[PDB]
């Protein structure tokens, strides 16, 4: 068994609600496809405000309902991420404006930066911040990341 090693970094503002859901989902997919050894996956924040914190409790329990677990600590996106990751996928256009800005700060930017939702077969471009929502909104977010990541993998696979 042999292919190339591919890398994806999932990005949100805080790296507490959404990017850990999208990251964990994506890991479960790869693991389920027997393709983990070919993938490098991680999640990070635009902001430094929550570095080191654990994922929201609502994200945590939501992933559990689906039999998924995570051990992520929040970390900030850095300049080297633009040189090391094949893909940076974010949640919203704000995340997107911010990364492009920072990427400029890099000379040799090899990362393709895009909205995760741009992969959604249902076309919901945007993945809403569920922080102030309740438990059904987290379930809605999980659902979108599932759609998107399944579609992302299948074309980069
Ligand atoms: O942790 V995030 O989804 O930015 O809230």
Swiss-Prot record:
Which keywords label this protein? Acetylation, Cytoplasm, Hydrolase, Phosphoprotein, Protein phosphatase
- Domain of life of the source: Eukaryota
What effect is documented for mutating residue 62 to S?
2.5-fold increase in activity
**Catalytic activity of the protein:** O-phospho-L-tyrosyl-[protein] + H2O = L-tyrosyl-[protein] + phosphate; a phosphate monoester + H2O = an alcohol + phosphate
Note the SS bond partners: none
One Pfam family this sequence matches: LMWPc
The active site consists of 12, 18, 129
Residues modified as Phosphotyrosine:
131-132
- Asked if the keyword Transferase belongs to this entry, the reply reads no
Is Chloroplast found in the keyword set? no
Q: Which InterPro entries match?
A: LMW_PTPase (IPR050438), Ptyr_pPase (IPR023485), Ptyr_pPase_sf (IPR036196), Tyr_Pase_low_mol_wt_mml (IPR002115), Tyr_phospatase_low_mol_wt (IPR017867)
Catalytic activity, EC: 3.1.3.48, 3.1.3.2
Supply the Gene3D superfamilies for this chain: 3.40.50.2300
Q: Activity regulation per the record?
A: Inhibited by sulfhydryl reagents.
UniProt-listed SMART domains: LMWPc (SM00226)
Q: Which is an annotated GO molecular function term of this record?
A: acid phosphatase activity
Cellular component per GO, a single term: cytoplasm
State the post-translational modifications: Phosphorylated by LCK. Phosphorylation at Tyr-131 increases its phosphatase activity.
Q: Which SUPFAM superfamilies match?
A: Phosphotyrosine protein phosphatases I
The chain residues annotated with the modification N-acetylalanine are: 1
Task performed by this protein: Acts on tyrosine phosphorylated proteins, low-MW aryl phosphates and natural and synthetic acyl phosphates.
Q: Which family does it belong to?
A: Belongs to the low molecular weight phosphotyrosine protein phosphatase family.
Q: How does it assemble?
A: Interacts with EPHA2; dephosphorylates EPHA2. Interacts with EPHB1. Interacts with the SH3 domain of SPTAN1.
Q: What is this protein called?
A: Low molecular weight phosphotyrosine protein phosphatase
